[PDB]
Symmetry: C2
Subunit: 235 residues, 2 copies
């Protein structure tokens, strides 16, 4: 009845009035490639490193089951597929979303969406959380808060699935293509601070051919940040 016309992502969709977490459901359940798990609200929304994600009604909370037939070295680029997908859909709604390494999309430096990729094997779960018409935590923003008016959620859904379908199909073909789109749409050239084992500061200049963030320290030293147990902050 939805009439989706995408090739893989969205071949099926399981909608929930509410769920604990779409990622948890997708990881746990036996689902086929391309199945999309979406829910009005999550009671146990999750972010990275055991962080929790507010998921009240009005936002877009979905997860996509994937089985990327590409080399294991490319898997980390999947988080970017999500990130660019959102950016593209925000641009469709004339919202200037910008990517923040490693998994965030901001509007005027205020987070409007999160992206979390979990699992491995032959089943990757692409989790996405965009604020649309829902209330959001302090410091964050939403499509509705950006346009000054409510946005038809189902329209945002169709737009995102459509972009992700195209992005994903091309990624299976050319796994490198995504990083060009990531560069063009990521927040670079500004001072950033990296928290992992200890921490350091410098300018985030670009992402290399592995999606790793390249930081140039004041000492002229250049570090390559790989996403894992790490956090990025703007100065």
């Amino acid at each position: 009845m939805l009439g989706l016309k995408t090739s893989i992502i969205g071949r099926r969709v399981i909608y929930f009035q509410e769920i604990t977490s779409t990622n948890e459901f997708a990881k746990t359940s036996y689902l086929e490639e391309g199945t999309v798990i979406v829910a009005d609200k999550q009671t146990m929304g999750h972010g990275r490193l055991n962080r929790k994600w507010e998921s009240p009604e009005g936002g877009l909370w979905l997860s996509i089951v994937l089985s990327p037939k590409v080399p294991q070295k490319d898997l980390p680029k999947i988080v970017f597929l999500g990130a660019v997908g959102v950016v593209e859909t925000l641009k469709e709604f004339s919202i200037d979303g910008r990517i923040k390494w490693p998994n965030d999309v901001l509007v005027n430096y205020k987070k409007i969406a999160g992206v979390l990729v979990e699992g491995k094997g032959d089943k990757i779960v692409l989790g996405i959380g965009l604020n649309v018409n829902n209330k959001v935590p302090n410091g964050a923003t939403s499509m509705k808060l950006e346009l000054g008016s409510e946005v038809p959620l189902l329209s945002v859904f169709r737009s995102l699935i459509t972009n992700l379908d195209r992005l994903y199909l091309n990624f299976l073909k050319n796994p490198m293509d995504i990083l060009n789109l990531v560069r063009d749409n990521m927040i670079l050239g500004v001072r950033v601070k990296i928290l992992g084992d200890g921490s350091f500061e410098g300018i985030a200049e670009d992402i290399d051919d592995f999606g790793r963030l390249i930081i140039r320290l004041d000492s002229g030293e250049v570090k390559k940040v790989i996403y894992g147990d790490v956090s990025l902050r703007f100065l």
Copy 2:
């Protein structure tokens, strides 16, 4: 992201771009009560017995999982809940549908929808087929044809599912109410013929407290017809 506000029916919806039969899928896979199985297109549409149900794009093909734990005798009224439901949403779109015993709803005697309930284990699958914008078989009709314009498929979906939910919740408490609604919306007082070995004709008088069709043959003899492999024809 659908924002459905149903109590039971529509708590979860599993959409497919394509499927064999939503009824069969709903029968073979464990699903929770209220789960709705819907597809843009069915490849193996199913009618009663071994009849096929055309299910091209543009129509509404869905099945709902139920386990109403009320007396066994009432179980057969499920089909009517589906038909009355279709009749209700049709009126919402200004179309007057009429229930043809036992599982059909006609619009000026042209079949616009059909209902098919299958009882698997102690789980009951209510199957519904409604023609909306799709191509229909010769002799049949669709909402698009009655209105002369395309109808937003999702709008009809929301409408039917809120209606069924309401009808169902009351069924669980007052399983006897549904019959009245059927009598008020069924095609009776007319001449019909019931086919099969033992075929006969008569006036379709009323519907039993069991949902049986009461027929008055020209002899004055009254037969109570149960829906099995009997075929109802209008003369």
